Amino acid sequence: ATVLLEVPFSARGDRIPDAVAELRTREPIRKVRTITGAEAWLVSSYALCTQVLEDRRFSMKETAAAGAPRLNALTVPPEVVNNMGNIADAGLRKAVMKAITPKAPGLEQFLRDTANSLLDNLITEGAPADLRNDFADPLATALHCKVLGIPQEDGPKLFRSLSIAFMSSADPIPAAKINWDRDIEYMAGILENPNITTGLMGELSRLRKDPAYSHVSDELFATIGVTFFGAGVISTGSFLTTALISLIQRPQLRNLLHEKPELIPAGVEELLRINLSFADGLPRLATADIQVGDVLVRKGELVLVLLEGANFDPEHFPNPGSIELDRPNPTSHLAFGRGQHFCPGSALGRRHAQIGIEALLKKMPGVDLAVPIDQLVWRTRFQRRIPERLPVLW
């Protein structure tokens, strides 16, 4: 006898387990057990993953319901799970989206300057360098501070919460609540602070005093700050870090991108397609009985949408394991999700990575791992897969 198949399969973000392709071929929707002991349907094909993400009856918001089968414990108040729904009901959607485009005046130039300076410092200190702690994360953090309109120097203090905030835990985390309340007070301070007049927090401070928003709660305005900072920094830092690994391990692609950098955006779209930064399937709770492939999912059940099941599905991406820059369907991956909850920071995340990669290839064209790739230490029980340190030489 064996126990019901457990998720997640592996914390390694440099390779996909052979088990995924076998699941997808034999059972593209199938029952698994999550770290909390709940059962769930794991969906691993492109077609079923898209079907679930496009059908709002598989609810993101209902995942936070008391007594529901859980992927993991809430690290936020239950209402914050419906964050985008709350933003839209407040009439704040267009304003938040407008504040987070990579196309703000001088934002891209800021990213480039920041990436270059980080790299100069690494080059000056001498190899080995940690491309995670001293490149990708400081880059993601600096970008988000500029986007929020908050002081660059406040970035490290906010960043400190993230190794706990984005944990994927069987049980509630006391530190997540301490950090959450603390970060919420920080952002409430920012809304009151007269020096903060640019970016997202600048915009939110003005809308807050605008009579058309006078019934929007102060808790929502602060929440938007914390969540958009947290989600943005964790997602871009993790993506860029694991994309640098995929790049470092393909010196041919790396030379091609070094030599023809106009290919970097197509390069990034392939790195997004193949990325394993999301550690768990995207969770949804069935609010009706709904046929998914051979399975009738029952109202009240938990479904997990496995991004790399879709993104490595050979029926949709032939030779899925190869980065190929001339695919006919390059942005059709699910790295940013799909449907109602499609990532609102997608353009920002694309530009963060394009610029970081461009700067890396220019400054460090001989970049290579300074340790055998098995020596990378993969963070466990976390909503992202990332190496604790990314040691490189050049």
Among 232, 320, 356, 387, binds ligand HEM (CB under 6 A): 232
Q: How far is the CB of 341 from ligand HEM (least distance, A)?
A: 3
| CA separation for the pair 87, 374 (Å, rounded) | 42
Strand partners, 29: 43
Which CB sits closer to ligand TDH, 34 or 161? 161
Residue 157, annotated as binding a ligand:
no
Stretch that binds ligand TDH, among 38-46, 75-83, 112-120, 309-317 (CB under 6 A): 75-83
Q: Is 258 annotated as a binding residue?
A: no
Instruction: For residue 228, give the nearest of 88, 84, 62 by alpha carbon.
Output: 84
Task: Give the DSSP H/E element, type plus range, for residue 391.
Answer: strand 391-393
Residue of minimal Cβ distance to ligand HEM: 345
Out of ligand TDH, ligand HEM, none, what residue 235 binds, judged by CB under 5 to 8 A for its kind, is ligand HEM
155 binds ligand HEM (CB under 6 A): no
Window 211-230: contact mask with ligand HEM (x via CB under 6 A): ----------------xx--
Rule CB under 6 A: is residue 235 a binding residue for ligand HEM? yes
Q: How far is CA 50 from CA 92, 277, 315, 371, in A?
A: 27, 19, 13, 38
Nearer to ligand TDH, 158 or 359 (CB): 158
Question: What are 181-188's contacts with CB under 8 Å, separation 24+?
Answer: 183/158, 183/226, 183/229, 183/230, 184/219, 184/222, 184/223, 184/226, 186/154, 186/157, 186/158, 186/226, 187/221, 187/222, 187/223, 187/224, 187/225, 187/226, 188/218, 188/221, 188/222
User: Which string of x and - marks every residue 332-361 that binds ligand HEM (by CB under 6 A)?
Assistant: ---xxx---x-xxx--xx------------
CB 24 within 8 A of CB 45: yes
Would the annotation count 83 as a binding residue? yes
For the residues of 59-99, what is the DSSP string, one character each? Answer: ESGGGGSTT---SS--SS-GGGGGHHHHHHHTT-HHHHHHH
DSSP label of 285 = E
- Interaction of residue 235 with ligand TDH, rule CB under 6 A: no
Q: Closest separation between CB of residue 67 and ligand TDH, Å?
A: 19
Contact positions with ligand HEM (CB under 6 A) in 272-301: 277, 282
Contact 242/33 with Cβ under 8 angstroms? no
Name the token pair of 199.
């970016």
Looking at the Cβ atoms of 45 and 59, the one nearer to ligand TDH is 59
Which x/- pattern, by CB under 6 A, does the window 189-228 give for ligand TDH?
A: -------------------------------------xx-
Separation of alpha carbons 24 and 40, rounded Å: 16
Amino acid at 78: P
Contacted by 348, from ligand TDH, ligand HEM, none: CB < 5 to 8 Å by type: ligand HEM
* Residue whose CB is less far from ligand TDH, 172 or 318: 172
> What's the order of all strands across the beta sheet hosting 302-305?
29-33, 39-43, 302-305, 282-286, 58-59
The nearer residue to ligand HEM, 12 or 341, going by C-beta atoms, is 341
Whole-number Å distance between alpha carbons of 190 and 222: 8
Q: Please identify, among the stretches 40-48, 117-125, 161-169, 254-262, the one whose residues bind ligand TDH according to the rule CB under 6 A.
A: 161-169
From the annotation, which residues make up the binding site for substrate? 75, 83-84, 235, 299, 383
Binding site for ligand TDH (CB under 6 A): 75-76, 80, 83, 161, 165-166, 180, 183, 226-227, 230-231
